[PDB]
Amino acid sequence: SRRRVVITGMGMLSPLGLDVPSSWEGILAGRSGIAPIEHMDLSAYSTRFGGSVKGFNVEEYLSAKEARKLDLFIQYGLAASFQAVRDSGLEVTDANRERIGVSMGSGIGGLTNIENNCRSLFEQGPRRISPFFVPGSIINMVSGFLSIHLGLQGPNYALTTAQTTGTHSIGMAARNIAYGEADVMVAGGSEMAACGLGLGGFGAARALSTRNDEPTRASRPWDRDRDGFVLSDGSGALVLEELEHARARGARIYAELVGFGMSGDAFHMTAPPEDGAGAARCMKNALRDAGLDPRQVDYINAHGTSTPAGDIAEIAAVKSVFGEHAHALSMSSTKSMTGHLLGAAGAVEAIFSVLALRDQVAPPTINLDNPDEGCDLDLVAHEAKPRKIDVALSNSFGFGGTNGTLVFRRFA
Amino acid sequence: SRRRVVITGMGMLSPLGLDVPSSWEGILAGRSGIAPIEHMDLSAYSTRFGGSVKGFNVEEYLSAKEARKLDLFIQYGLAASFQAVRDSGLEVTDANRERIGVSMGSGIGGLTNIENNCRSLFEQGPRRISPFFVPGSIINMVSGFLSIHLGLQGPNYALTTAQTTGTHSIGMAARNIAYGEADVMVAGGSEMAACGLGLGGFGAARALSTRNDEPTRASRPWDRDRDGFVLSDGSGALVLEELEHARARGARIYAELVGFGMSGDAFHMTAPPEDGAGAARCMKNALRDAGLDPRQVDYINAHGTSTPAGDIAEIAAVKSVFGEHAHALSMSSTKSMTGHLLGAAGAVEAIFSVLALRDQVAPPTINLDNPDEGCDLDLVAHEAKPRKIDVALSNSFGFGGTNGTLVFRRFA
Ligand SMILES: [K+]
Ligand SMILES: [K+]
């Protein structure tokens, strides 16, 4: 009924590194990538730190002339995409390019570019807007430009499901491959909302931590002194591949993507329900899609955003799905270190989940000094935990109560 | 292998009407919905007309208090969604709500809201941004709020593939139902980019017609004196339903959704290739997905945007897919009347395609006074053409060279 889908390539920019292996070394070491933001003047803002991408040089991937039309969220998406296509060793030919596509998305897209063109329009009027504004700032153009730069002719689209984007992108790209619409898909997410509208919009909603004096401690999922999420930038991308197609060309396979689930809370615009019953259904859907019993799960990479309401819902949902086995699995939030990459969070965390399968180690939940009422599971507090990981889950639960769960598994 | 998917409900706001049947009466009569734009001062702009939604009253759907947080693209999406859920006669219960989802998207989303919050931020600083800015302006919240207002717990996501959004949303929602992930999906698209950044961004790219003296004549697909697309607002939404589920409750079925195809040009950021070879592959994929031979197609609702390069590519692609039969089918662009609803274009045109199957009539391509070189097919110039329509196709081809084709068919 379904062809099998594996991960043959990965790419990343995060607040911990300009590629995957540098970012992952950071994760394993408990390193925070959070810091006061240098690129702009945040003095008037109630929050002043974030996970920024540091030292990014777009001209590793594109000429200065190409790069200049494109919002940072696009540059970030192409870079992760390029890394991953490279990482995969895939050679794109006339014989396969119609079988290779792209699903790279974003939660908010080109907010920086829109900001800047907004300034021009207000001060100098319509004619000063760039002619590349639209193509260089709408969300589908990570997918757009990547297909052009790589001559990829397969399914070409983009999701935008806020903080769940990255997770849904990967899952539905795998469904493209399982359905026969593609053999290969580049999927993932990118974001750069660290601009005045991003930080101010999230500040206005009071959704962000305001621990300005100690930014590396701001993101503390399941800690009783948590005060909101930490906004972060970057991108993740995976090369998904039908199993036989990868065997045929001798691909290195990191892991198998076995399950994808989805759900809606149908509850509230920004807050999850106390019992996490939407997240519970999503994980259950993802497990059944993988043909798995809850007891076969060894590691969960949580959404774990460091909001009061969400961290606790996620515990409820895990306890209700997994029962007693909730105490045997390890769950951690690597947002404790990376911050919340929004639409890219799902993508980088899928990659963290795959790496956790490769190296048999559960990354840590840093800053988990005083676990709140109920937060009594193995949350890998403080430091990496080597252990058996056969099956690894990655959740994302975003505004609009939109939920997504991926299930990965060691390959053989 | 696949469950069968039918259309049981439809909703719409367009520049021709505040619902489906008013909009469709306009279409059949050759009525243009294009007019100089009243809602803002366009004097400094090189284009000054558009397809606006006229007389919209959001309080038919939501309280003033609800409505006020939400960008117009969201209001427009919920309204079409509500219409269509209503139109369908579906009763949402605890027994089915986990089987009912939403895929409603947009190409650019809340550009108006972002504009306004941009002004506040510039003049008055961060603290003046609304706390509802983010939830009320990001694209996934049509889906978000609809699932909350209707208690829908099934798959919840949103696409953003620019001018192809509406087409992809519907196609992938049908795939949700064919796969077993849902029995029912509300899918479609909404847009309101008629704000300074929209009109100015598209003006800066020189992509818009500038026929300000005669706006009802600006949109003239395949006419030799065409000078770019006409920007338009609104929304379409369809209730997709597994076939047995609809039979079981005695649903009225408009038509069957039998095919969905996708492709990438991999060519250019904004311009299609001269031969339309990407669009050709997309239609071919869509036909094969439907189990259909080209000769079985009676009517095509074209992308037909009134750009020089795109209108002509689409002819090339149709001639190459359909061969001699290209001269027996009828193709028309209802953008001649509606203008280009961008991310909603696909959604309203899917609805036009379904209505064309219901009433056995091909809508007209208005303004097609002098067909360009090569534009010698039956393009239903000027006035509606009653005829046999068993099978109807709807194309969309958007920036990034992203392509989508839907195939509908009379039900029995
Ligand atoms: K996660
Ligand atoms: K169309």
Author numbering:
A (entry chain A), B (entry chain A): 2 to 413
What are the paper's exact sentences on this?
A potential target for antibiotic drug discovery is β-ketoacyl-(acyl-carrier-protein) synthase II (FabF), which is one of the essential elongation condensing enzymes of fatty-acid biosynthesis, a highly conserved metabolic pathway among key microbial pathogens. During fatty-acid elongation the acyl-carrier protein (ACP) substrate transfers a fatty acid to the S atom of the catalytic cysteine of FabF. An unusual feature is a completely buried potassium-binding site that was identified in all three structures.
To further investigate the active site, a PaFabF-C164Q mutant was generated that mimics the acyl-enzyme intermediate, thereby forming a competent state to bind the inhibitor platensimycin. A dimer constitutes the asymmetric unit and the structure is essentially identical to that of the wild type, with an r.m.s.d. of 0.24 Å for the overlay of all Cα atoms. The mutant is believed to mimic the substrate-bound state of FabF.
